[PDB]
Amino acid sequence: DESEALRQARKDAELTASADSVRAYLKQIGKVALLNAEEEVELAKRIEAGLYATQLMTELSERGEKLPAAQRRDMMWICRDGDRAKNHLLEANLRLVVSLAKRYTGRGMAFLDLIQEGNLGLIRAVEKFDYTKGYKFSTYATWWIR
Amino acid sequence: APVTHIWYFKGVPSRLGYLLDLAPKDLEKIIYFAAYVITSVDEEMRHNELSTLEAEMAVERKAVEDQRDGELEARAQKLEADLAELEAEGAKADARRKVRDGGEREMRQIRDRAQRELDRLEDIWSTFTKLAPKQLIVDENLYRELVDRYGEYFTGAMGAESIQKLIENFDIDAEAESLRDVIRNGKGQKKLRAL
Amino acid sequence: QIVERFGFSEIMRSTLEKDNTVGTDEALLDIYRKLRPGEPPTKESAQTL
Amino acid sequence: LYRRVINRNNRLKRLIDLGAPEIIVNNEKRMLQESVDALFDNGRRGRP
DNA sequence: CATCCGTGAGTCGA
DNA sequence: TATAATGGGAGCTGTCACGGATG
């Protein structure tokens, strides 16, 4: 079924980058897989943990005292993992922005400039996302990106 | 963030391309973020750990090869065991040819899947060993793999600011004489581009 | 059918002979690869366009 | 063309503070590149 | 010796 | 600003003669 020719021909195309700036951005997004309903919840759980390990140490730096070498390092990893998980949730639903930015084309503002500001909204959206409500990420994001 | 003056890039002959001995086509994939460019590399540290790194990379290759040979063995075991199980069922001998070819096709895929892994690990090791400034790694995954494996050894950048770095570490005096030597050589085609 | 319909000429016999690849799948993929480089070539994405 | 550059250049500043993913950051940088290029010489690279 | 990109192709007026 | 929603869209058509980089 799967020939060796196609397996080489696929990577030949994908590896080459088109001249259109719009296309080259569209191609880059297609890499990251879309998120499952429960997968979304995981990241949300992670970011919350990550976003909170940070709030701890933030106020601790101004007051003075700091955690021990075992705690601060364990604390610091949640911070990394959290900020890492953040950058994942954005890259995943990066398609979502492009989906409803295309509708605003031909309005005296560039498509790319529309996606970017749309992305900019997506960033704020993921910060105030709450996984306690059984709502998917796609709904609370849309209202933010619009 | 820095951005390249279009007049010296797209203007033909590409002044920037001529300065860094870079291809007009390759220069594109850098500046407009379609390919990473190797900016600098700690060759000494690469050398001082070259012996150990090779050993590491080799064990990973073997561990790939070991699983392949064990995975293929188990499949040959069940291929022969099923062709006899369908023999104890007294099925038509031609109906065993569908099960024979089925196994051979499966074993083939296994070997090729394992081979593509080895070939990647080959292209990975090959790339690192011969890594140097002004190299373009247009394939991101190899680069992603490359940064993680030996990120401590080189400086990988991308875009218009990476171009800026190349210009910074650029020795005009050295690159000038290096071209006059090629001019002193009679060879015409390489003297043309060096002129 | 290529030999049948255009066989009366030696310029089409010479064309089908210098033909690089054969196969309905290998033709669509080939045309796809030359029209839109930079995109994943499915057997169902080349048949479509 | 001036207004185009500054709008994107500023946007890049906001994204960096936000620590946006490199995929988004790099897209902006590319846009900025073409914006300044379009200003300096329109149609030269890519469609005008 | 033949392809690909970039750059030429009259002036006044209306 | 909490239902869920997740990869664009018009291309543009009838030059011409030439030098430089590539063949």
From Swiss-Prot, chain A:
Q: Where in the cell is it found?
A: Cytoplasm
Q: Where is this motif: Interaction with polymerase core subunit RpoC?
A: 113-116
Its UniProt miscellaneous note says: Was identified as a high-confidence drug target.
Q: What does this protein do?
A: Sigma factors are initiation factors that promote the attachment of RNA polymerase to specific initiation sites and are then released. This sigma factor is the primary sigma factor during exponential growth.
Its subunit composition reads: Interacts transiently with the RNA polymerase catalytic core formed by RpoA, RpoB, RpoC and RpoZ (2 alpha, 1 beta, 1 beta' and 1 omega subunit) to form the RNA polymerase holoenzyme that can initiate transcription. Interacts with WhiB3 and probably with RbpA probably via its sigma-2 region.
Question: What does the entry note on its domains?
Answer: The sigma-70 factor domain-2 mediates sequence-specific interaction with the -10 element in promoter DNA, and plays an important role in melting the double-stranded DNA and the formation of the transcription bubble. The sigma-70 factor domain-2 mediates interaction with the RNA polymerase subunits RpoB and RpoC.
The protein, known as: RNA polymerase sigma factor SigA
The residues of the intact protein that this chain contains are 207 to 352 of 528
Swiss-Prot record, chain C:
- Listed as disulfide-bonded, the cysteine pairs are none
Lineage top rank: taxon: Bacteria
Q: How does it assemble?
A: The RNAP catalytic core consists of 2 alpha, 1 beta, 1 beta' and 1 omega subunit. When a sigma factor is associated with the core the holoenzyme is formed, which can initiate transcription. Interacts with CarD, TRCF (Mfd) and RbpA.
Give the family from UniProt.
Belongs to the RNA polymerase beta chain family.
Purpose: DNA-dependent RNA polymerase catalyzes the transcription of DNA into RNA using the four ribonucleoside triphosphates as substrates.
Q: What is this protein called?
A: DNA-directed RNA polymerase subunit beta
Curated annotation (Swiss-Prot), chain D:
What upregulates or represses it? 6-fold repressed by starvation.
* Sequence intervals crossing the membrane: none
Organism classification: Bacteria, Bacillati, Actinomycetota, Actinomycetes, Mycobacteriales
Full protein: residues contained: 343 to 390 of 1316
What is the annotated role of this protein in its UniProt record?
DNA-dependent RNA polymerase catalyzes the transcription of DNA into RNA using the four ribonucleoside triphosphates as substrates.
Highest taxon in the source lineage: Bacteria
Q: How does it assemble?
A: The RNAP catalytic core consists of 2 alpha, 1 beta, 1 beta' and 1 omega subunit. When a sigma factor is associated with the core the holoenzyme is formed, which can initiate transcription.
Report the protein name in the record. DNA-directed RNA polymerase subunit beta'
The family classification in the record reads:
Belongs to the RNA polymerase beta' chain family.
